[PDB]
Amino acid sequence: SMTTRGCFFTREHYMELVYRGLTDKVGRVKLLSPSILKPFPLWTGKQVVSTLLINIIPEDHIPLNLSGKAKITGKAWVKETPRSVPGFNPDSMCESQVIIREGELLCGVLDKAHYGSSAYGLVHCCYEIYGGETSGKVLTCLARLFTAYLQLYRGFTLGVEDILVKPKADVKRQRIIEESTHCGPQAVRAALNLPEA
Amino acid sequence: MIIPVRCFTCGKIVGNKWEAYLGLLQAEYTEGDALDALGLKRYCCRRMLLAHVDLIEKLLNYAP
Amino acid sequence: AGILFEDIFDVKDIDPEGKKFDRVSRLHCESESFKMDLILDVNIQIYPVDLGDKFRLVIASTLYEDGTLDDGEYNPTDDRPSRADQFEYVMYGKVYRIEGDETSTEAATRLSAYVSYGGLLMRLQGDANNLHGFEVDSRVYLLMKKLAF
Amino acid sequence: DAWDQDRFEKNFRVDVVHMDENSLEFDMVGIDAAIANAFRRILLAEVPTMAVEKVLVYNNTSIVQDEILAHRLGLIPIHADPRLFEYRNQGDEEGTEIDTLQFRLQVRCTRNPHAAKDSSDPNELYVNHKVYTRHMTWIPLGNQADLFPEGTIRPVHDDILIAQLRPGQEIDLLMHCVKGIGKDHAKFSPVATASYRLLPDITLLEPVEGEAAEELSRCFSPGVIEVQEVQGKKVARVANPRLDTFSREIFRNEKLKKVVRLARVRDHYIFSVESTGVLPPDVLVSEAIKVLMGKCRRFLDELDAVQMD
Amino acid sequence: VKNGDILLLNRQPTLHRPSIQAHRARILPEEKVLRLHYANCKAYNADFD
Amino acid sequence: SYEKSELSLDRLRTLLQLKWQRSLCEPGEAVGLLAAQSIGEPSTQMTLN
Amino acid sequence: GNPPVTGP
Amino acid sequence: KTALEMVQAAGTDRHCVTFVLHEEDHTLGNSLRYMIMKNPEVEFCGYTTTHPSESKINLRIQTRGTLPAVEPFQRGLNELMNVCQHVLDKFEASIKDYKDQKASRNE
Amino acid sequence: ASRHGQKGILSRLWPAEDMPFTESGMVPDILFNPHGFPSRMTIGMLIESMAGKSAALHGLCHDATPFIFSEENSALEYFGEMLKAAGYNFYGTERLYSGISGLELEADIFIGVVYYQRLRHMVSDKFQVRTTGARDRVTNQPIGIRFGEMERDALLAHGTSFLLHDRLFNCSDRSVAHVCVK
Amino acid sequence: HRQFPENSLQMMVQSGAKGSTVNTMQISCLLGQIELEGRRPPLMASGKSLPCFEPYEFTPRAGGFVTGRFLTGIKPPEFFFHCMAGREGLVDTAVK
Amino acid sequence: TMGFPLLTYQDRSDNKLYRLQTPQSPLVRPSMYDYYDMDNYPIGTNAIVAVISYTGYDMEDAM
Ligand SMILES: [Zn+2]
């Protein structure tokens, strides 16, 4: 939810999230710049994860490139019916594919595919480039970041409003169940080779 | 067993509202009006006095 | 001037693929003075764009219009009168891919430019003569301002 | 933008709505959440009070135990002013005039001789069978009889049911009140609950008329949308948006989720400070503002003691 | 034991090589339980219950 | 591909071959208990369904 | 949510 | 016995210092963080509690343009004292203007 | 636990000022994770939360007998309308602020009243911390905490012969012996 | 009612947090066919599925096709079948 | 459940009796709970439970 395209922090909150992620590190905390400079200085939620990556990759080392896929597919974001754009494959600029360039997180959504127990992701790519201290810091710092975005700015819940069904797509359920009490006999005549009379 | 002195959630003294709640239910109020008229407006305060089994009038029968 | 690109666009369609992210609208466009398309994500709370709105577009490498200096660090406490902010909506992000339809040749006549503004993407496809200064991992500005005619 | 002090001494105002005994509701226009939350969180856990800490039993022959009685006594508000008393210094069980108070709860229960023929109502059968908090004799120690009037050191409520006794059954204990804040133990908190809420603004983006205005008046809390006639039609307007409980019931209605813009007003908090009675709620808020200042004084004193130059 | 020292941490059944690890101690005040980060409780196959 | 491309085939091969060389199992690996456990810990997950 | 008596 | 420690970046750099404020929590460190971020000589001001079992806050103040971080810390302490004194004054002058209309209305 | 078979363990007693207080003034009393639901599918804790919130707000006691709610008269179009009558939200979601910051959480939080219980299956109160333990008569080693024959296996799999030599030889039953070397 | 990404259950399912696209369909759509050690639940010694149902009844409701959800409610036959399918797994775990 | 077992604590000499001080009755309950009078001996306490992932100490069967 943070690294989705809709998040936009301001300057006082980005600096709080980054220092909840990190903690009393011996070093100057270096920061990115706004993704939106005017009408308001705004920081996207991908820039917080980027700022958190650059600040725990060590000093002499340069940051890592990466490319990959996420676990949310491109069919999961769709709401209307996709009109076919003439000269544009929709998967080329899509939140399915994670594109990290020079440490900054430039496309895609982070999921279990990257920072969980799934292989060939960010916290395993930082094992086979940087080492064991750095990946075991990326886990801790992304943990503290992703919790201290839930204490402070967004909550996460489950209610009786997210497991419900529209009233128009629930009449197209009670016209299938009413058809599903009449399929008794025809599945036995064709199971025992009797004729239809 | 006996009514708690304070509500658990917020610390309002609800421990003085047990006899003057039995007195309102004996004088024919509904429980949706015997809790507002004692000044219990939040549903954590109402909870303490609505759902209370005062299990010491049953436990003092076994007395020396 | 550090202007890498400058043109006048016209929105013809809004989010045709139907993904509908919150606070972000995808704006397919066409050009006027060049022969180009444009697929830009905006922030729709702050700077709202509807279909049929013309707006000028400038991609620059530095915001200091008095010489190409390319500082990089953001200082809010310092304001110079030589910024290129006569425009209304200003983003910042780096170019991550450029692609084209070359057939054993160099820089074919339909070249692309993929800019990632912190998460909001962009595809500026057109002639290779109009997209010279886009190198990969070059940190460019976006500058736009709504016209009304 | 930087902190213009004359932009804060021009756009800050406290508007007291309702104040009575043991309650207060006011505004704070033009203050951000990081100071408002500091005031709330000092009212709940840092403004100090007096509360019962040690209990000295002899013959608790009651059904309410020796432990639950002590915990139940500790949660009783004591109406001594906290500011006259100090923290009891650590590792000192016996107290003095400055630190401790003492009470005594000595109640025997014996059968009632008179007015008891062929009845079963318990008040008519027993004397002292509900140990209330008006049974606490204040035993003054040292020279506290001169600092305080006759009948000021006192339990706040005097109607709290401590125990319930039967004949033979006795309570003979002695207490020791101490001073503490509402972070050591939450029996020291002086507030029922202190909380704030932003002020809502409900904006009608479209003129509603007729049969939709009475529908709109029931989607909000009773008091918000009044529906009054203006030349034959029943138009609707906003009236006290403060009452709105912000339940979002209008966004369930499809025709009228496009004629309201239900949001909030930035930095227009509405506090509500309900005291437990130990201090009035206008001294709890002042002694909550005056603790954040002391937390800021102590660290400047530390910096003055660290650098000499 | 102070706040850098290794304690060697064991969870039964010790059925594979990451079922014993070397964790740096950190003396948390006023507690009577051990504490682990959540990344560790899949290698130890732990269930917190 | 219009990126930097500072490296060529002669050095890409060298990084891949030195990653092959550096990934050799070092002397002292105790591989017998790493193959006595990789067929002994997933042999507890094998219930009869 | 009563209107404030000490107003503007 | 003291209740403020200062932990430098490298023993020489005085712009970055992480103030360790003993016996505090988010009551002070969220309002100090609000005041110090209103100072344009601060690149970065954020706070974290070390661990909830502990009773101290870390406060990273990181100053641009050649100032020690003791000056935005002192200015943000006095500039919060001068908020609370004024809030105390306008609160004790609206309780008084409420008691002086509850009483002197019909009594 | 609850009455819908959903155990929790008490992990952290969170101080009250840090709890997310609601718009009514209330703090919660128990915070329950939204990640205990989708693998366990206890819809009944949601209806019990709406139902107990709406019963504590009206002085009612609500009927939760099985099989009395159909599919044309649901258990969420009943207590939702009970909450709409009591002013609150139809879906049980109340607007919560925070207490570690001070400002409003942007996704509205499901709150209500759920009858928790308390199991006898208590904390073990058995911390077996060992230092200078008593030695028995045969095999004078700790009488103590057991290393174990299967943990030897994992230490050998690491390649740590000296942690293993420490825990076996140096800590338990080290002694000298005198041998005629001829 | 609310889709992804607004939906919290779809966020926990599709971002790999806990669920699956089978538990959400048992919550907000049918439970589907109750299979019991591979097959439909046992007919009695008299050829009726449960004491509610007629001897050798053709309808899918006789063989455990529940077609009601955990959201709105399970009727008592569709509940007894479901308890068979749960005790089957708990027995086949607890014994062997 | 540690609940309210019995009323005669003095003349019973069990090994362990787990008593819960202040148990409440459930506000939402089936009709069988009153048919057998289970408010003579109730087992648990009501609680104002929020479903939020606020802290981080709040995962994998913990609260
Ligand atoms: Zn309460």
Rounded to whole angstroms, the Cα distance separating D102 from D79 reads: 13
How many Cβ pairs closer than 8 A exist between chain A and E?
7
Query: CA-CA distances (angstroms) from residue I112 to B8, B47, I45, I50, J85?
Result: 15, 11, 10, 6, 32
Ligand 1 center to B14 CA (angstroms) = 8
**B43 in a known ligand binding site:** no
Ligand 1 center to D225 CA (angstroms) = 30
* Residue from A6, A55, A65, A67 nearest A35 by CA: A6
Question: By the 8 A CB rule, do D43 and D288 touch?
Answer: yes
DSSP string, D108-125: E-EE--SS-TT---HHHH
Q: What's the number of CA atoms in the CB half-sphere (13 Å) around residue H85?
A: 10
Phi-psi region of B60 (alpha: psi -120 to 50; beta: other; left: phi over 0): alpha
Residue for token pair 């820039």: A47
Put simply, whether A31 touches H (Cβ < 8 Å) is yes
Contact E13 F34 (CB under 8 A): no
Q: Where are the alpha helices (DSSP H) in chain D?
A: 5-8, 33-45, 68-74, 122-125, 144-147, 211-219, 281-306
Using a CB-CB distance cutoff of 8 angstroms, which residues of chain I are in contact with residue J30? none
Q: What are phi and psi of C38, to 5 degrees?
A: -160, 130
Question: By the 8 A CB rule, do D101 and D154 touch?
Answer: no
Burial I165-176 (b: 16+ CB within 10 A, else e): eebeeeebeeee
* Residue from D175, H34, A155 nearest I95 by CA: A155
Contacts with C127 (C-beta within 8 Å, 6 or more apart), sequence order: C34, C35, C36, C109, C110, C111
Label the pairing between strands D126-127 and D110-111.
Answer: antiparallel
Contact A139 E39 (CB under 8 A): yes
* Residue from C104, C97, C100 nearest C135 by CA: C97
Query: CA-CA distances (angstroms) from residue D156 to A104, D33, D53, D80, I99?
Result: 61, 33, 17, 9, 29
Question: By the 8 A CB rule, do D169 and D127 touch?
Answer: no
Multiple choice CATH, D46-192, 2.40.50.100, 3.40.50.720, 2.170.120.12, 2.60.120.10 = 2.170.120.12
- Respond yes or no on whether the N-terminal peptide bond of residue E13 is cis (omega within 30° of 0): yes
Q: Where are the alpha helices (DSSP H) in chain I?
A: 44-56, 79-85, 149-158, 161-165
Query: CA-CA distances (angstroms) from residue D34 to A41, A42, B6, H28, I59?
Result: 21, 20, 29, 9, 38
Put simply, whether A150 touches K (Cβ < 8 Å) is yes
Question: By the 8 A CB rule, do C144 and C117 touch?
Answer: no
> Among all residues of chain F, which has the CA nearest to that of E14?
F41
Phi-psi region of E27 (alpha: psi -120 to 50; beta: other; left: phi over 0): beta
Q: What are phi and psi of B11, to 5 degrees?
A: -80, 35
Q: Hey, where are the domains in chain C? A: 5-149
Q: Tell me, rounded to whole angstroms, the distance of Cα A133 from its chain centroid.
A: 25
Label the pairing between strands I30-32 and K45-51.
Answer: parallel
Of A11, A23, A31, the CB nearest to H48: A23
> Which of helix, strand or coil describes residue A100?
strand
Burial H49-59 (b: 16+ CB within 10 A, else e): beebeebbbbb
The number of folded domains in chain B is 1
Residues 57-96 of I with CB under 8 A from D: 84, 87-90, 95
Question: By the 8 A CB rule, do D182 and D190 touch?
Answer: yes
- Respond yes or no on whether the N-terminal peptide bond of residue C16 is cis (omega within 30° of 0): no
Residue for token pair 């100032």: H67
> Which of helix, strand or coil describes residue C89?
strand
DSSP string, D191-245: EEEEEEEEEEEEE-SS---THHHHHHHHHS-TTSEEEEEETTEEEEEE--GGG--
Contact G6 D15 (CB under 8 A): yes
Using a CB-CB distance cutoff of 8 angstroms, which residues of chain A are in contact with residue H56? none
Angle between helices A45-54 and A133-147 (to 10 degrees): 150
Residue for token pair 């909450």: I83
> Among all residues of chain G, which has the CA nearest to that of D241?
G1
Q: Is I18 exposed, middle or buried (0-12, 13-18, 19+ CB in 10 A)?
A: buried
Put simply, whether K55 touches A (Cβ < 8 Å) is yes
Question: By the 8 A CB rule, do A155 and I20 touch?
Answer: yes
Query: CA-CA distances (angstroms) from residue C129 to C34, D198, J59?
Result: 10, 55, 71
Domains of chain A, earliest start first: 1-149 (1.10.274.100)
Using a CB-CB distance cutoff of 8 angstroms, which residues of chain I are in contact with residue B47? 56, 113
Contact E38 K62 (CB under 8 A): no
* Residue from A156, A144, A157, A155 nearest A16 by CA: A144
Rounded to a whole number, what is the largest CA-CA distance in chain H? Answer: 70
Subunits next to D (3 or more Cβ pairs <8 Å) are B, G, H, I
Amino acid at the residue D266: R
- Respond yes or no on whether the N-terminal peptide bond of residue D280 is cis (omega within 30° of 0): no
Put simply, whether I156 touches K (Cβ < 8 Å) is no
* Residue J44 CB neighbours (<10 A): 11
Rounded to whole angstroms, the Cα distance separating A122 from C26 reads: 28
Helix (H) or strand (E) holding C143: strand C139-146
Rounded to whole angstroms, the Cα distance separating J62 from J42 reads: 10
Question: By the 8 A CB rule, do J72 and I74 touch?
Answer: yes
Rounded to whole angstroms, the Cα distance separating C57 from C34 reads: 12
Which residues of I sit within 8 Å Cβ distance of E? 7, 9, 123, 127, 148, 150-151, 153-155, 157-158, 163, 167
DSSP string, I37-55: STTT--THHHHHHHHHHHH
* Residue C54 CB neighbours (<10 A): 14
> Which of helix, strand or coil describes residue D181?
coil
Residue for token pair 């991550």: C96
Contacts with D85 (C-beta within 8 Å, 6 or more apart), sequence order: D50, D98, D99, D101, D179
Question: Looking at residue A103, what DSSP letter applies?
Answer: T
Residues 9-68 of D with CB under 8 A from G: 13, 15-18, 25-27
Ligand 1 center to I21 CA (angstroms) = 12
Which resolution in angstroms does this entry have? 3.1
* Cα Rg of chain K, angstroms: 16
- F38: its two tokens: 């990789």
* Cα Rg of chain A, angstroms: 24
* Cα Rg of chain C, angstroms: 15
* Residue H65 CB neighbours (<10 A): 12
Label the pairing between strands D103-108 and D191-203.
Answer: unpaired
Q: Is K57 exposed, middle or buried (0-12, 13-18, 19+ CB in 10 A)?
A: middle
Rounded to whole angstroms, the Cα distance separating B44 from I113 reads: 8
Q: What are phi and psi of D132, to 5 degrees?
A: -90, 175
> Which of helix, strand or coil describes residue E42?
helix
* Residue from F33, D118, D102, D34 nearest I164 by CA: F33
* Residue from D162, I47, I123 nearest K2 by CA: I123
Ligand 1 center to B53 CA (angstroms) = 18
Q: Tell me, rounded to whole angstroms, the distance of Cα F37 from its chain centroid.
A: 18
Determination approach: cryo-EM
Q: What are phi and psi of I165, to 5 degrees?
A: -65, -35
- H20: its two tokens: 């360790």
DSSP string, I153-179: HHHHHHT-HHHHHIIIIIISS------
Subunits next to C (3 or more Cβ pairs <8 Å) are A, F, H
Amino acid at the residue D279: L
**I137 in a known ligand binding site:** yes
Question: By the 8 A CB rule, do C18 and A79 touch?
Answer: yes
DSSP string, E2-33: -TTPEEEEE-SS--SGGGEEEEE----SS--S
Question: By the 8 A CB rule, do J21 and J13 touch?
Answer: yes
Using a CB-CB distance cutoff of 8 angstroms, which residues of chain K are in contact with residue E37? none
Q: Which domain holds residue B26?
A: 1-64
Q: What are phi and psi of B62, to 5 degrees?
A: -95, 50
